[PDB]
Design a protein around this nucleic acid. Structure first.
Ligand SMILES: [Mg+2]
Ligand SMILES: [Zn+2]
Lengths: 119, 489, 51, 497, 447, 99, 199
DNA sequence: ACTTGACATCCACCTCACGTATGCTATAATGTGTGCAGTCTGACGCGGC
DNA sequence: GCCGCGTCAGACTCGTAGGATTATAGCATACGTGAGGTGGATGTCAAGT
RNA sequence: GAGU
C-alpha cells in the first residue's frame, strides 16, 4: 500500500493537473470529494508504482527522505520548491526530539490537529 | 518553543544579512599568546559572543550585572558564551559565486530553468567563452556560446546595444532579467498549438518548475551567492588536547582559504590588475566556495594534511557517520551500562540478574534523592560521598528503588521489538548480567561471549510502558508469526 | 512509517480473494494458515437444503 | 596569430577544471619582449605621469592649496614630522636645508602675482600671455612629488569633475524620465552662449502648445539652477580652457595605464618559475602564483629603466619578497610576525648540522648554546612551535573516530554539580532568614545574593546611613552567628568543599 | 628517516603483535595479508580473492583467518613452506625416481607443482623402495584421483604440511569440522597463561618445536654443566668439546622475571633444570610463561564431564567447581602501566609534590616527600599514586561562595588537583616506579 | 561498564563512547526501531532528549528525580539545533514555523 | 640495490658528481629496554662513504680535478629485534608478510559480464613494478582498445604509430602475408598448403 | 549603637615598552607540477547516436 | 530501445595503539597594544564616641 | 578481534 502511495493523472479539475501529473493517491481523492460535490471537473487517475527507493523519495516529508539517502539531491529538491513539513511522520518527530505520533504520542499529536483549527 | 511545521527554502542574501550579525574580514583565528579571539577574525568575540560567561575580552566588564551592555574598548557584548552556538556571521564576496549544489548535482536546477546544457554553462563560468545576455540588436539571441575572437569580430563592427559577458555575474544578470511570468504564459500558448507527445512531456516538466518557483516566492538570482553565511564558532570549534596540541574543524580551513582569495581579490580590484589574473582569482574563489560546501564534488578533491580529502559541510550531514545516522535517528545514551550475559536458571520469566556495581551507577540520582528524604544525608554532596565510600545503607536504598522498577535490556542486533525488553532486575554481586533461558530465542542470544546493554526507563511513563507493553511476560506471541516466541530450547 | 491506525472502520466493501496454496503435491500453507486473524469482506455461501 | 592556437585547444578542452592548464594556455598566448622593449614601455609611463603633473601646474587652485597647506604646518612654530613629513621628499633630477626652502618659496609667490597681472589685460592668453602661461608650466614640471602627495592632488580635480557630472545626473533623472525631447537641438545653444539670458526667451520662439505650463513650479526651477552655477563661480575657470585640461589629463592617464598593463602581461612566466620553487609540500601550488602576481605588480611600478639593469634581476627581488611576506602572513591558523618566523627558520637549518655531528639529537641546552640564546626561550619556542591538528582527523587508523568523538567539554558542568550549586544557594537563603532585620539586610546587600547588585562596604554605608567600619563589625557579628556549628551543620558538610 | 618511520609506525602492515601466548606471537608474525600498499582493500575484494584456491595446498593453511570482514584476506603460512629469492612460495616434496622413493627433497613453486603427479602423505609405502598400492592416491593438474606408480614423480613430505601453526596443535583435527577448526586455531591465540602452566597431556609432538622457536624460553647455546642457578641468572660451564680455548667458557643467561607484555599479559621465565646437571646444545633451561619443560603450556587440563545440568550449562554455558579457584588454576597475572606527566603551560609549571589541598591525610599517607607512592604498597580504586599540582584558572565564585569562604576561611588557593589517581574496579601491588628527570631543572628527592 | 552520567561530546553534546571516557552506550537507528515497534513515546523521548543532547532536560530531570518527581519536562535535542544552523551555513533557509 | 640505482649521481652540468663507495652501521645507540621505557624507536646510525669527485670543463674527461672522500651521515634506521619484532615509539609491532599480485602480464576474460550477448571480451593487463600501466581490452564489436594508465579507450594501432611504425609495418607483424603475382591475363598466388585446410 | 583617623590591601586607567607591518635589494634568472586512484556491481538516470 | 557514461549506495553495539610532514633571509622605521605601574578607592583596626 |  505504501508502494501505491502516488499515481498518474489524466485530466484536471479547475486545479493544476493535466496529462501525466505525478500526485499522491490521497491528494487525488481530496480533489475528488471537494470538487465533485460542487460539480466542476473531477480528475481521473491511475495508481502508479514506487518500489522502495522510489517510494521513499516520493513521500511528503523531506526530512524523512533526507534521512534516507541521496541527501544532496533530495535537499536541493526541497529547497527549490520551498517545501513545508508539518511533522506527520515518525522519523520526523524522532529527529525533532518530539512526541512520536503513534500510540503514547498519537494522542498528543492528534491534539495538535484541533489546536491548528482553533488559535 | 511551541512550533508546528518547517519550511525549507532558498537563502536570500538579505535573509543571511538578517541572521548574520557581523562581517568576518580577517583570516586570523586567535592570538598566539593570549589565546583569545582576534578582532574581525573567525573566532571573534565581537561577532559571535564572549569566550567566557558575561566576561569580555579585555576584562573591564564582568558579572551578571551586565546583560546586553557593550564593552566600550574591545566591543564585546556581555552575555552567555553559549551564544557562539547560535550567532551567525557573514562573508561579503566581491565576486558572487555559484552555488555548487545547483550546478554539479543532478538535475542542476539552474540548467533546467534556463534550458541550458552543462558544459556550455561551464565554459561560461570558467571564463572559457562568452555568453549572450540581451541585445536590442537581433545580431544574437539568448544563450549562445562565443569564444575569444568570436566575441571580437562582433563588437568591432557593433557594440553599443550588444550586451554579453562572461561568468557567474553574467548568469545572475540573465536570471534577473528573464521574464518568468511571460515564459509561463508563452509555454501554455506553445501547448495551444502543436502538443506533440514527447515535446509536450518535457514542456510539461519545465513549466512545473517555473510555476513552483514563483509560488514559493523565490528569486532565481538567489541562486548565486553574494553574501555567504558563516557558521557559528562552537560548531567549528578549536580546542587544545591535554598534550598541548590543538584540534580544529576542517570547515575553518576551507573558510580560511576562501577569505584569503576573496581578500586578495579586493586588493587586486583596488590595484586595477589585468583581467587574466581577475579571472584566475574568480575560478579559485569559485573553487574554494564549492569545496567548502561540497568537497570532491567539483574538481580534484582538496586534501587534508594526511592524504584524505577534507570533510565539508555536506559531508557532515549526509555521511552514514554524518549527523543523521549518528546524531538524529539514533544518539548516545545516558543511564546505561553493559556487560557479558550468563544463564540464570533460577530467574523467573520477568527477571534478569543485574550486577551490583552496574545498577549502582545507573540509579545514582535516585539514591541521592532518597538519601536526602530519609535525612540519612544532610545534602546532596554528602550523599555522593556516601555512595562513593560504599557503605551498607547504599545497598538498602538501592534495594528499595530496584523494587518494582524495570530495567531495559538491549541486545544488538535489533532483530525485532523483543531485542529490547523490560525486566525486573535482581541484584547480585559479580560483574555478569544474568539472563533467563526461555527468552534466549527472542534475543537470539547464546552464552559464549555475547554482551547486553542496559538502560533505565526513567519517568513514571517509562516505567509504566516498560511493565505494560515491554515486559517479556506481556509479549509472548510473535508479531512476526502468530505463535509463541518464548519457548523451550 | 506513517501508516497507522487512524480510523477504526472506513467501511469499504472491496477486498481480495485468498486461496489455500496447495502448490504441487503438498498443501504448504492452507487457508486457515493464511487467513487467520483477518477481517473479512463479503458474505460467504455454499447452497444447501437451506443455504 | 597567437589568437589561433587558443581556440583549437579550447575546442578540445575536455572540460579542463584544473585551473593550472587554463592559466598556462592563456599566458601561453602572449610572448615575451626582452631588453630594450621593456624600457620602451617604461619611458611611456614616465610621459603619462609627466603629462598629468603639467595639468596640475596649469590650475590656480592646486598651487593655492600647496602654499596654504605648507603654511598650516609651518605656522605651528617649527614642526618636525606630521604634515611636513608627508610633504617634501623631492627628487631633484631626506634633510632639506632651511636656506633652500626659504628661497624656493620666494620666487613662487612672485610668479603668482606676475601671472595674475598678465591674464587680466586684453585676453586670458593673448599671444604673449599664452607664452608666459606655458613658461610657468615648465617651472612646475621640474620637481618630482612622491606619489603620496600627488595622489590627494589628483583626486580633488577628479572630485570636482565628478561634482559637475553628478549634479547633471541628478537633474537628468527628473528631466529624462519625466519629460522627453529630441537631443539634436541642444548642442548649438549650450555651446554657443553659456553665460547670457538670450537662449532663455529665444527658446520659446518655436511655439508648440506644450510650452505654456511650467510656471507653477517656475520658482523652484531656476533657483535650483543656482547650485550648478555656483560650481562655476568657485572654480573660476574659463569655458575654452576647461575641457582641454580634462580631456588631455585623461589622455596622460590612459597612456600610462595601458602601458603598464602591457608590461605586466609580458612578464608572467618569470613569476610562475619563481613561484614553483616553493611549491614543495608547504602551501598551495596555485595560491603561490596569485600572490606572486601581486609582487610582479610591485616590480612594474617601482622599476626604473634609468638604473640600466636587466629587468629579470630586479623583478626577482619584488616577487620573492611578496611570496615570502604572503606565506608568513597568511598560511597558518595562528598568524606569526616576522621576527618569530625568522627565528624558526634559523632553528631548523642548524638542527641538521647538530644532528649530524652529535650522532643523534640536540638537547635544548646544546641547541641553545649554538644559537647564543637563553634555554627557556628555546624551550618555550619549541612549545609554541607545533601547529593544530584537524578536528575531523581520522584518529582511528580505521575511519572509526574523527577526533571530535573523543572530545570532552569542560564548560558544561554535570547535573550532579548543578545540584551542588543550587542546594547551597537554597541553604544560604534559609540561613539568611535567621539573622535580625537590619543585619539580614546588610549581609544581603553586601554580598548581592538575592539582589541584583553586590554592594561593597562603602556603598552599604551610603545607603544605610553614614556607617563605615561599623558594618565591618556587622560582618564579624554575622560571622559569629554563622560560625555557630549548631546553625551551620549542613554548611559544615560543604567543608570537604 | 621520515619515510622509514612512516613505513614502520604508520603502515597497516606494521601492526601490534598478539603476545598473549608464545603461539599468538609466533603465528602472528607468519600471517600473511593480501592487503596494504600495492594490494587489495576491503571493498576491493569480491568473491574472487576471498574463496579457496586448491593450490593453497602445503603453502597456506586453508583454515587460519579472521572471520567477517578480514576473512579470505589474511592467512597463515603453512608449516614447511618457504620463499625463493624472487618471493614465490615453495613447498618441499619427496622425489620418487621411477617407482622408488629417494631421500631427496625438492622445493617446488606452484606452477611447477601443477605439472608433476604427487602422492598423498597417507599413501602406503614399502620398506625404503616402492609403493604398497598399484593404484595410488595422487594429485596433479590441480585435480585429485587414482594414478599408477610409473607416472608418479613426487610425494607429500608429511601430513602436517597442509596446515599452519595454530591448527597443528589440535590433536583430533581429523574429526573436527572446519567451522570450528578455524575458530579453534583463532582461540588458541587468545589464551592467557596462568602462573601455574601445565603441559598439554593430549598433544601432537608439535608442542616442543613451537615453544622453542617462540624464543620466550631460555635455551642453552653450547650446553655443558650448570654451575650456578638463580631466579635471576643462570650460569653454565661449557664442555671442553664446544669450548673455545682463548676466550672464557662461562655462558651467561640473564632471566626476564615478571615482565609486562603488550596485551598486559605476564612473561616470567622460571629455571627448570637442576644445579650441576649436564645438558647439551638447545635444551630448554628456563620456561617462558606459557611453557612447560620445553613444551607449550598454553593452558591446563581438567576433569570434564559431558552432561546437562539444571540449566547451568544451557547454551554452551559452562559449570565449574570451586576447586578451580581453590587451586588457583586459571589465575593470571596482569601488569598495567600508568603514567603521569608534569608539563609547563604559560598558566604555570606543574609540579610533582605531596602537596594536596583538601584531601584526607589517609590518602596522603601512601605518598612520600616528593609525592611518590612507596614502592610495593597495595592500592585500591580511587587511591592516588602520584602527586601533581596545577595552576587553577580564574573562577568568579558566586557571592554565596565568597560568603562561605569568608566564614570558614579555608585556605583555598588557585590550584587544581592534577595527581594521577588509581583505576576504578582494579587494584593490587605496585612493583616498580620509574623517574624521568629533565636535565635543566634538578631532580626531586625521590628522583 | 557502568554509566549514569559523565562527559559529553563537544559538538553534538552527546555522551562520548565507551567506559574509556565514561561514555554512554549508543541507542542506534536499529535500537530506535525497537521502541517504535512498541508504542512507547516517552521512552523514545528520554533516549532522544534527556539522555543525549538535551542539556536543560537532563539537568532539570536529574533534580526532579532526586526530589521525587520522575517527570520529563521536555526540551529540544541540541544535535538538531546543530543541524539547522549547518543548513543555514550552506545557504539554505531552515526554520521553525510558528504554529 | 638502492644506492647503485641512485648513484653515482652526476651534476646537471656534467662536471661535479657524488659517488657511492660503501656504508657502515653504528652499533645501536640505546638499548631495547630503554627504548620501551622512554618511548623511543630502536634505531642504528647509518653512515656512507661518499666520494665527491669533480671533473673539468676544460680538460676533456679528466677525472683529475678534486677527490674529497668521507663518510656522510644519512640518519637513523629502525632495527629489528631478535624475535623478529620492532620497537616503535616505545611499543612492539611486527611487520606482517604481504601477498600481492606479481608484476608482469595478466590475460583476463570477461565471463558474460556486460551485454545481453555474453560477449567473450578478453583483455591484457600489464603491471610493471614502477610506472604507469597498460590495458588492452576487446570491444564487443571485436575491436582492440588500449587504455594508457587505464583511463579511457582508444585504438591499439595508434600506439604503434607513436612507436615510429607506419600502417604497413603494423599489418605485417600481425596478420599473415600472401604473395599474389600478375602474369599474362591470369592470377597466380604463392600458396601455403596449410592455408586452405577446412574450407 | 555609631563616628573618626590611620593604615593595609586592593581594583581601575594611564604612560611607556616591545611587538608587528611594510617597504627595499640592481650580474642574470621567464611552461611545469604531481598524482595515485582503480577495478566490486546491479541500478536508476541523462543524453545521444 | 541499445550501448554507454555517470552517480550512489552497500547494520548494530562494544573492546583495544601511537602521531606527523618541509627548508626557509633580513632589516629599518613607525605605529599601536598589552602588561605592569602608580594613585585612588575601599577594606581593616584600634580607640573613641 | 569478540560475539549476535
Ligand atoms: Mg556453541
Ligand atoms: Zn572589554
Amino acid at each position: 500500500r505504501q508502494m501505491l502511495r502516488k499515481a498518474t493523472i489524466v485530466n484536471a479539475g479547475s486545479s493544476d493537473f493535466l496529462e501525466g501529473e505525478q500526485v499522491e493517491y490521497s491528494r487525488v481523492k481530496i480533489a475528488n470529494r471537494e470538487l465533485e460535490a460542487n460539480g466542476k471537473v473531477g480528475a481521473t487517475y491511475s495508481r502508479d508504482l514506487l518500489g522502495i527507493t522510489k517510494a521513499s523519495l516520493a513521500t511528503e516529508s523531506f526530512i524523512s527522505a533526507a534521512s534516507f539517502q541521496e541527501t544532496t539531491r533530495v535537499l536541493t529538491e526541497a529547497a527549490v520548491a520551498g517545501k513545508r513539513d508539518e511533522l506527520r511522520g515518525l522519523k520526523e518527530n524522532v529527529i525533532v526530539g518530539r512526541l512520536i505520533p503513534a500510540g503514547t504520542g498519537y494522542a498528543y499529536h492528534q491534539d495538535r490537529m484541533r489546536r491548528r483549527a482553533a488559535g | 518553543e511551541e512550533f508546528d511545521a518547517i519550511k525549507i527554502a532558498l537563502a536570500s542574501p538579505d535573509m543571511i544579512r538578517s541572521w548574520s550579525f557581523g562581517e568576518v574580514k580577517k583570516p586570523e583565528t586567535i592570538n598566539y599568546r593570549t589565546f583569545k579571539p582576534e578582532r574581525d577574525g573567525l573566532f571573534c568575540a565581537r561577532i559571535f559572543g564572549p569566550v567566557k560567561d558575561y566576561e569580555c575580552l579585555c576584562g573591564k566588564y564582568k558579572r551578571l550585572k551586565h546583560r546586553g551592555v557593550i564593552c566600550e574598548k574591545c566591543g564585546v557584548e556581555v552575555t552567555q558564551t553559549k551564544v557562539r552556538r547560535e550567532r551567525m556571521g557573514h562573508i561579503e564576496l566581491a565576486s558572487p559565486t555559484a552555488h555548487i549544489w545547483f550546478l554539479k548535482s543532478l538535475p542542476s536546477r539552474i540548467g533546467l530553468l534556463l534550458d541550458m546544457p552543462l558544459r556550455d554553462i561551464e565554459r561560461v563560468l570558467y571564463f572559457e567563452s562568452y555568453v549572450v545576455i540581451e541585445g536590442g540588436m537581433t545580431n544574437l539571441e539568448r544563450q549562445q556560446i562565443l569564444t575569444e575572437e568570436q566575441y571580437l569580430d562582433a563588437l568591432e563592427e557593433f557594440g553599443d546595444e550588444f550586451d554579453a559577458k562572461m561568468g557567474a555575474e553574467a548568469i545572475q544578470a540573465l536570471l534577473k532579467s528573464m521574464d518568468l511570468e511571460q515564459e509561463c504564459e508563452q509555454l501554455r500558448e506553445e501547448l495551444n498549438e502543436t502538443n506533440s507527445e514527447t515535446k509536450r512531456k518535457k514542456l510539461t516538466k519545465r513549466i512545473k518548475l517555473l510555476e513552483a518557483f514563483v509560488q514559493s516566492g523565490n528569486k532565481p538570482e538567489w541562486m548565486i551567492l553574494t553574501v555567504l553565511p558563516v557558521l557559528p564558532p562552537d560548531l567549528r570549534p578549536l580546542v587544545p588536547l591535554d598534550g598541548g596540541r590543538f584540534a580544529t574543524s576542517d570547515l575553518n580551513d576551507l573558510y580560511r582559504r576562501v577569505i584569503n582569495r576573496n581578500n586578495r581579490l579586493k586588493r587586486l580590484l583596488d590595484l586595477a590588475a589585468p583581467d587574466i589574473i581577475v579571472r584566475n582569482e574568480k575560478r579559485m574563489l569559485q573553487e574554494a566556495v564549492d569545496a567548502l560546501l561540497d568537497n570532491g564534488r567539483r574538481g580534484r578533491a582538496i586534501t587534508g594534511s594526511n592524504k584524505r580529502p577534507l570533510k565539508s559541510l555536506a559531508d557532515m550531514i549526509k555521511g552514514k557517520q554524518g549527523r543523521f545516522r549518528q546524531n538524529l535517528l539514533g544518539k548516545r545514551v545516558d543511564y546505561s551500562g553493559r556487560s557479558v550475559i550468563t544463564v540464570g536458571p533460577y530467574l523467573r520469566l520477568h527477571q534478569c540478574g543485574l550486577p551490583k556495581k552496574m545498577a549502582l551507577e545507573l540509579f545514582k540520582p535516585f539514591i541521592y534523592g532518597k538519601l536526602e528524604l530519609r535525612g540519612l544525608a544532610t545534602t546532596i554532596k554528602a550523599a555522593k560521598k556516601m555512595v562513593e565510600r560504599e557503605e551498607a545503607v547504599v545497598w538498602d536504598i538501592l534495594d528499595e528503588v530496584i523494587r518494582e522498577h524495570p530495567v531495559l535490556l538491549n541486545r544488538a542486533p535489533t532483530l525485532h521489538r523483543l531485542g529490547i525488553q523490560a525486566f525486573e532486575p535482581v541484584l547480585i554481586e559479580g560483574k555478569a548480567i544474568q539472563l533467563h533461558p526461555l527468552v534466549c530465542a527472542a534475543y537470539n542470544a547464546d552464552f559464549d561471549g555475547d554482551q547486553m546493554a542496559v538502560h533505565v526507563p526513567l519517568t513514571l511513563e517509562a516505567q509504566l510502558e516498560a511493565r505494560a507493553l515491554m515486559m517479556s511476560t506481556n509479549n509472548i506471541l510473535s508479531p512476526a508469526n502468530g505463535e509463541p516466541i518464548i519457548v523451550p530450547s | 512509517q506513517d501508516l497507522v491506525v487512524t480510523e477504526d472502520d472506513c467501511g469499504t466493501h472491496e477486498g481480495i480473494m485468498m486461496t489455500p496454496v496447495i502448490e504441487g503435491g503438498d498443501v504448504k500453507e492452507p487457508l486457515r494458515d493464511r487467513v487467520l486473524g483477518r477481517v473479512t469482506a463479503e458474505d460467504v455461501l455454499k447452497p444447501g437444503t437451506a443455504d | 596569430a597567437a589568437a589561433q592556437v587558443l581556440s583549437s585547444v579550447e575546442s578540445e578542452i575536455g572540460r579542463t577544471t584544473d585551473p593550472v592548464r587554463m592559466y598556462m594556455r592563456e599566458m601561453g598566448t602572449v610572448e615575451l619582449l626582452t631588453r630594450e622593449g621593456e624600457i620602451d614601455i617604461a619611458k611611456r609611463i614616465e610621459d603619462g605621469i609627466n603629462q598629468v603633473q603639467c595639468s596640475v601646474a596649469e590650475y590656480p587652485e592646486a598651487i593655492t592649496y600647496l602654499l596654504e597647506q605648507y603654511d598650516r604646518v609651518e605656522a605651528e612654530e617649527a614642526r618636525l614630522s606630521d604634515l611636513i613629513t608627508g610633504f617634501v621628499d623631492p627628487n631633484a633630477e631626506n634633510s632639506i636645508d632651511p636656506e633652500l626652502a626659504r628661497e624656493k618659496f620666494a620666487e613662487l609667490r612672485a610668479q603668482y602675482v606676475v601671472t595674475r597681472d598678465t591674464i587680466k589685460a586684453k585676453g586670458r592668453s593673448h599671444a604673449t600671455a599664452q607664452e608666459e602661461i606655458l613658461k610657468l608650466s615648465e617651472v612646475f614640471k621640474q620637481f618630482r612629488l612622491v606619489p603620496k602627495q600627488f595622489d590627494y592632488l589628483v583626486n580633488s580635480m577628479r572630485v570636482m569633475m565628478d561634482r559637475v557630472r553628478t549634479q547633471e545626473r541628478l537633474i537628468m533623472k527628473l528631466c529624462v524620465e519625466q519629460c522627453k525631447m529630441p537631443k539634436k537641438n541642444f548642442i548649438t545653444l549650450f555651446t554657443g552662449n553659456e553665460t547670457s539670458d538670450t537662449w532663455f526667451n529665444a527658446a520659446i520662439a518655436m511655439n508648440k502648445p506644450w510650452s505654456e505650463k511650467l510656471h507653477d513650479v517656475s520658482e523652484e526651477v531656476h533657483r535650483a539652477l543656482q547650485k550648478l552655477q555656483q560650481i562655476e563661480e568657485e572654480t573660476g575657470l574659463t569655458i575654452e580652457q576647461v575641457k582641454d585640461i580634462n580631456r588631455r589629463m585623461s589622455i596622460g592617464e590612459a597612456k600610462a595605464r595601458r602601458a603598464k598593463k602591457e608590461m605586466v602581461e609580458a612578464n608572467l612566466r618569470l613569476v610562475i618559475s619563481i613561484a614553483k620553487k616553493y611549491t614543495n609540500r608547504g602551501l598551495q601550488f596555485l595560491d603561490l602564483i596569485q600572490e606572486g602576481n601581486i609582487g610582479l605588480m610591485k616590480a612594474v611600478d617601482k622599476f626604473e629603466y634609468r638604473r640600466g639593469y636587466k629587468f629579470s634581476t630586479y623583478a626577482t627581488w619584488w616577487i620573492r619578497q611578496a611570496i615570502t611576506r604572503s606565506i608568513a602572513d597568511q598560511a597558518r591558523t595562528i598568524r606569526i610576525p616576522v621576527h618569530m618566523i625568522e627565528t624558526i627558520n634559523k632553528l631548523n637549518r642548524i638542527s641538521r648540522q647538530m644532528l649530524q655531528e652529535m650522532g643523534r639529537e640536540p638537547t635544548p641546552e646544546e641547541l641553545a648554546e649554538r644559537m647564543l640564546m637563553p634555554e627557556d626561550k628555546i624551550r618555550k619556542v619549541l612549545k609554541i612551535a607545533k601547529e593544530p591538528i584537524s578536528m575531523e582527523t581520522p584518529i582511528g587508523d580505521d575511519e572509526d573516530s574523527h577526533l571530535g568523538d573523543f572530545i570532552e567539554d569542560t564548560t558544561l558542568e554535570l547535573p550532579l554539580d548543578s545540584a551542588t550549586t543550587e542546594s547551597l544557594r537554597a541553604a544560604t537563603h534559609d540561613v539568611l532568614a535567621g539573622l535580625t532585620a537590619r543585619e539580614a539586610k546588610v549581609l544581603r546587600m553586601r554580598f548581592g545574593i538575592d539582589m541584583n547588585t553586590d554592594y561593597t562596604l562603602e556603598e552599604v554605608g551610603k545607603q544605610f546611613d553614614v556607617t563605615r567600619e561599623r558594618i565591618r563589625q556587622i560582618e564579624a557579628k554575622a560571622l559569629r552567628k554563622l560560625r555557630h556549628p549548631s546553625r551551620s551543620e549542613v554548611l559544615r558538610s560543604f567543608l570537604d568543599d | 628517516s621520515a619515510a622509514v618511520k612512516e613505513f614502520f609506525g604508520s603502515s597497516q602492515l606494521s601492526q601490534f603483535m598478539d603476545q598473549n601466548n608464545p603461539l599468538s606471537e609466533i603465528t602472528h608474525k607468519r600471517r600473511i595479508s593480501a592487503l596494504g600498499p600495492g594490494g587489495l582493500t576491503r571493498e576491493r575484494a569480491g568473491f574472487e580473492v576471498r574463496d579457496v584456491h586448491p593450490t593453497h595446498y602445503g603453502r597456506v593453511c586453508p583454515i587460519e583467518t579472521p572471520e567477517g570482514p578480514n576473512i579470505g584476506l589474511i592467512n597463515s603460512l603453512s608449516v614447511y613452506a618457504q620463499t625463493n629469492e624472487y618471493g614465490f612460495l615453495e613447498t618441499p616434496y619427496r622425489k620418487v625416481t621411477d617407482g622408488v622413493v629417494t631421500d631427496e627433497i625438492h622445493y617446488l613453486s606452484a606452477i611447477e607443482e601443477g605439472n608433476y603427479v604427487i602422492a598423498q602423505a597417507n599413501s602406503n609405502l614399502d620398506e625404503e623402495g616402492h609403493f604398497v598400492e598399484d593404484l595410488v592416491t595422487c594429485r596433479s593438474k590441480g585435480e585429485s584421483s587414482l594414478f599408477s606408480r610409473d607416472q608418479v614423480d613426487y610425494m607429500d613430505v608429511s601430513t602436517q604440511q597442509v596446515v599452519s601453526v595454530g591448527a597443528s596443535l589440535i590433536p583430533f583435527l581429523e574429526h573436527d569440522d572446519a567451522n570450528r577448526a578455524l575458530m579453534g586455531a583463532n582461540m588458541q591465540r587468545q589464551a592467557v597463561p596462568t602462573l601455574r602452566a601445565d603441559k598439554p597431556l593430549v598433544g601432537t609432538g608439535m608442542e616442543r618445536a613451537v615453544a622453542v622457536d617462540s624464543g620466550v624460553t631460555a635455551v642453552a647455546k653450547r650446553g655443558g654443566v650448570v654451575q650456578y642457578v638463580d631466579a635471576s641468572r643462570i650460569v653454565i660451564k661449557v664442555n671442553e668439546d664446544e669450548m673455545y680455548p682463548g676466550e672464557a667458557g662461562i655462558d651467561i643467561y640473564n632471566l626476564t622475571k615478571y615482565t609486562r607484555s603488550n596485551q598486559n599479559t605476564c612473561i616470567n621465565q622460571m629455571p627448570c633444570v637442576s644445579l650441576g646437571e649436564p645438558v647439551e646444545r638447545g635444551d630448554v633451561l628456563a620456561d617462558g610463561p606459557s611453557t612447560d619443560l620445553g613444551e607449550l603450556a598454553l593452558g591446563q587440563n581438567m576433569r570434564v564431564a559431558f552432561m546437562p545440568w539444571n540449566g547451568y550449562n544451557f547454551e554452551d554455558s559452562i559449570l565449574v567447581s570451586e576447586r578451580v579457584v581453590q587451586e588457583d588454576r586459571f589465575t593470571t597475572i596482569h601488569i598495567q602501566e600508568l603514567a603521569c606527566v608534569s608539563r609547563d603551560t604559560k598558566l604555570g609549571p606543574e609540579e610533582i609534590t605531596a602537596d594536596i589541598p583538601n584531601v584526607g591525610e589517609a590518602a596522603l599517607s601512601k605518598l612520600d616527600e616528593s609525592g611518590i607512592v612507596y614502592i610495593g604498597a597495595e592500592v585500591t580504586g580511587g587511591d592516588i599514586l602520584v602527586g601533581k599540582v596545577t595552576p587553577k584558572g580564574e573562577t568568579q565564585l558566586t557571592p554565596e561562595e565568597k560568603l562561605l569562604r569568608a566564614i570558614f576561611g579555608e585556605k583555598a588557593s588557585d590550584v587544581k588537583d592534577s595527581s594521577l589517581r588509581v583505576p576504578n574496579g582494579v587494584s593490587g601491588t605496585v612493583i616498580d616506579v620509574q623517574v624521568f628527570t629533565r636535565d635543566g631543572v634538578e631532580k626531586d628527592k625521590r628522583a | 561498564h557502568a554509566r549514569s552520567t559523565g562527559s559529553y561530546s563537544l559538538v553534538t553534546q552527546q555522551p562520548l563512547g565507551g567506559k574509556a571516557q565514561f561514555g554512554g552506550q549508543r541507542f542506534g537507528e536499529m535500537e530506535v526501531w525497537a521502541l517504535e515497534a512498541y508504542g512507547a513515546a516517552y521512552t523514545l523521548q528520554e533516549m532522544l532528549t534527556v539522555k543525549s543532547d538535551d542539556v536543560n532536560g537532563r539537568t532539570k530531570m536529574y533534580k526532579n528525580i532526586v526530589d521525587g518527581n520522575h517527570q520529563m519536562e521536555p526540551g529540544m535535542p541540541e544535535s538538531f539545533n546543530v543541524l539547522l544552523k549547518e543548513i543555514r551555513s550552506l545557504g539554505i533557509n531552515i526554520e521553525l514555523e510558528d504554529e | 640495490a638502492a644506492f647503485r640505482s641512485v648513484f653515482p649521481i652526476q651534476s646537471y652540468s656534467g662536471n661535479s658528481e657524488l659517488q657511492y663507495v660503501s656504508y657502515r652501521l653504528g652499533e645501536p645507540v640505546f638499548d631495547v629496554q630503554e627504548c620501551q621505557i622512554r618511548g623511543v624507536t630502536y634505531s642504528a646510525p647509518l653512515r656512507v662513504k661518499l666520494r665527491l669527485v669533480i671533473y673539468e670543463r676544460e680538460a676533456p674527461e679528466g677525472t683529475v680535478k678534486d677527490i674529497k672522500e668521507q663518510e656522510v651521515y644519512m640518519g637513523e634506521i629502525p632495527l629489528m629485534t631478535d624475535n623478529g619484532t620492532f620497537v616503535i615509539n616505545g611499543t612492539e609491532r611486527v611487520i606482517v608478510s604481504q601477498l600481492h599480485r606479481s608484476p608482469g602480464v595478466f590475460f583476463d576474460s570477461d565471463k558474460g559480464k556486460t551485454h545481453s550477448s555474453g560477449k567473450v571480451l578478453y583483455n591484457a593487463r600489464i603491471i610493471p613494478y614502477r610506472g604507469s600501466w597498460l590495458d588492452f581490452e576487446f570491444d564487443p564489436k571485436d575491436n582492440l582498445f588500449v587504455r594508457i594508465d587505464r583511463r579511457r579507450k582508444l585504438p591499439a594501432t595508434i600506439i604503434l604509430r607513436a612507436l615510429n611504425y607506419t600502417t604497413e609495418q603494423i599489418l605485417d607483424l600481425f596478420f599473415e602475408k600472401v604473395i599474389f603475382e600478375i602474369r599474362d591475363n591470369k592470377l597466380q598466388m604463392e600458396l601455403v598448403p596449410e592455408r586452405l585446410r577446412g574450407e
